[PDB]
Design a protein around this ligand. Structure first.
Ligand SMILES: [Ca+2]
Ligand SMILES: [Zn+2]
Ligand SMILES: [Zn+2]
Length: 559
């Protein structure tokens, strides 16, 4: 009966603990000794670990579903509560020490937060249907779609805080959430749907319009097929064969030729992304290594993109339209992080989404036959479209941009909400959140090929338009060169939790956020640090000093 102790912990399993959801089943309530740090993780302090699940049930597809959660409460506690976000189609339960993304080694638990994670309402080892594209099969049960969209995050947040109050004898002082990609989508949902849940939110590469991802996939697949060479084993063009890595490298080298010095400093980084988009056209741009146009004047050479190739990538990058020309997603920024050479290793973190690996007799691009393609067909098209795995690439090739995009707005049968309803987080009404003191940091890599950074930018533009002074509670950090959540030739690592707490608890807004490069080899250097700047600002070299050193740069308007 002493608070914050072994006996208080073990007493949480079963009924002296009163859970807010009566269908909470604790499977584990265990005292854990402090654990040492490892090469990939910081030390963990002594704590009560609780895991279990909420709302065990049987879905209409005959499969079991439940909301799993795991929670960690340190014996020596700073008064703060933390939840980490998801990834992909979720379905797995992590260590739940409180990941802060950004390629960070530290966990929130290592900083004496109480921390929690969920699997989002389904389980990849159980919910795996061979007739419904394996692990996207949760899409066959309506309620599992709801838990994946919002309800699992909500159930798990309430369960955590109630255990925190019981264990420590007081409510948490402040609460925080960080997530990227599908995790970024959840933090944006929380600020909109559950504004008192978290005081501080970080949301990277946010899939805030995730049901549109597969529409862009069918589009980029069909856009690249004329440049393909040869067929796969089902008869479908080898989309991966449309550009060798050498070809994509010619592109990004041409983008650097047009765009790199527009920020004032030729450094392999397009800091002035707006000016870059205004200036770069592959059908006219020069290959800076030779005098000549990037696009072949006649026959194809190695220093030379064919007119078929140039036409294809321009169309992929423009974004999908229907027959009326209505934009269905957004366009994509040209940026050097479409390629990248570190040593002899070409950068795949852009390629892998629309093209897949050149060196293969099959298609393996995310948007052609991989997970995003399958996820669309079973999780976001309503009704679901299960099919054998070998028909997926053909189905993106036949995808009809007048018919099939409607299916992310439809309800049908017992699927009573559309995929945009339960998964979309497009709302700019953040007033409840700001007016209890909430603070939000958005980030996003410029050469992300899952979600367009420019579409996060348009979202932030709509937010500040609807809430004047938005920069007093919400700020957006674009990262030139970064791929999806990590990687690529840019400064893709950063501590997002320290500036967030300062903002929430002390009122210090972030005028910049320090960042560094996970792969400085992309520039041939041992390290690069750069200020991330609050949109619309960009990093600006002070005129003197090592270009790889943050302190020589300041956040400023574009020139
Ligand atoms: Ca530059
Ligand atoms: Zn455990
Ligand atoms: Zn040559």
């Amino acid at each position: 009966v002493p608070l914050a102790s072994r006996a208080a912990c073990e007493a949480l399993k079963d009924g002296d603990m009163v859970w807010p959801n009566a269908a909470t089943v604790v499977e584990v309530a265990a005292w854990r000794d402090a654990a040492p740090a490892t090469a990939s993780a910081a030390a963990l302090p002594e704590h009560c670990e609780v895991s279990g699940a909420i709302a065990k049930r049987t879905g209409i597809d005959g499969y079991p579903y439940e909301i799993k959660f795991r929670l960690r409460m340190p014996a020596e506690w700073n008064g703060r509560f933390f939840m980490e976000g998801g990834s992909g189609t979720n379905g797995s339960l992590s260590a739940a020490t409180g990941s802060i993304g950004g390629g960070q080694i530290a966990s929130a638990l290592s900083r004496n937060f109480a921390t929690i994670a969920t699997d989002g309402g389904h389980d990849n080892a159980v919910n795996d249907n061979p007739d419904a594209l394996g692990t996207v099969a949760f899409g066959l049960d309506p309620q599992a779609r709801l838990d994946m969209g919002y309800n699992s995050y909500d159930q798990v947040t309430q369960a955590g805080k109630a255990a925190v109050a019981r264990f420590y004898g007081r409510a948490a002082d402040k609460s925080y959430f960080i997530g990227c990609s599908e995790g970024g989508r959840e933090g944006m949902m929380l600020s909109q749907r559950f504004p008192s849940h978290y005081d501080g939110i970080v949301a990277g590469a946010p899939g805030y319009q995730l049901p549109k991802a597969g529409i862009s996939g069918a589009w980029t697949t069909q856009s690249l097929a004329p440049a393909a060479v040869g067929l796969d084993a089902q008869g479908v063009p080898l989309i991966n064969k449309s550009f060798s890595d050498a070809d994509l490298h010619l592109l990004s080298q041409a983008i650097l030729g047009t765009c790199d010095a527009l920020d004032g400093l030729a450094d392999g980084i397009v800091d002035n992304y707006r000016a870059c988009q205004a200036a770069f056209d592959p059908a006219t741009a020069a290959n800076p290594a030779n005098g000549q146009a990037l696009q072949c004047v006649g026959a194809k050479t190695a220093d030379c993109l064919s007119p078929v190739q140039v036409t294809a990538i321009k169309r992929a990058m423009a974004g999908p339209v229907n027959s009326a020309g209505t934009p269905l997603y957004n366009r994509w920024a040209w940026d050097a992080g479409m390629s990248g050479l570190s040593g002899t290793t070409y950068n795949q973190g852009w390629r892998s989404w629309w093209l897949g690996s050149f060196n293969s007799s099959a298609n393996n691009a995310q948007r052609v036959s991989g997970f995003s393609a399958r996820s669309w067909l079973v999780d976001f098209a309503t009704p679901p479209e299960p099919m054998p795995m070998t028909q997926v690439a053909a189905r993106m090739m036949k995808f009809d941009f007048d018919i099939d995009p409607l299916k992310i707005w439809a309800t049908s049968g017992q699927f009573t909400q559309s995929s945009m309803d339960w998964h979309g987080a497009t709302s700019t009404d953040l007033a409840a959140f700001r007016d209890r003191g909430g603070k939000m940091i958005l980030y996003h890599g410029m050469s992300d090929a899952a979600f367009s950074a420019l579409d996060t930018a348009d979202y932030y533009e709509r937010l500040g338009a609807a809430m004047p002074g938005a920069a007093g509670f919400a700020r957006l950090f674009l990262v030139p060169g970064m791929n999806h959540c990590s990687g690529g030739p840019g400064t893709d690592r950063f501590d997002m939790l320290t500036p967030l707490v300062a903002w929430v608890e002390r009122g210090e807004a972030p005028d910049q956020i320090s960042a560094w490069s996970g792969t400085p080899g992309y520039f041939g250097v041992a390290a690069r640090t750069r200020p991330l700047c609050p949109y619309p600002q960009i990093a600006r070299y002070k005129g003197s000093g090592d270009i790889n050193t943050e302190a020589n740069f300041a956040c400023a308007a574009p020139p």
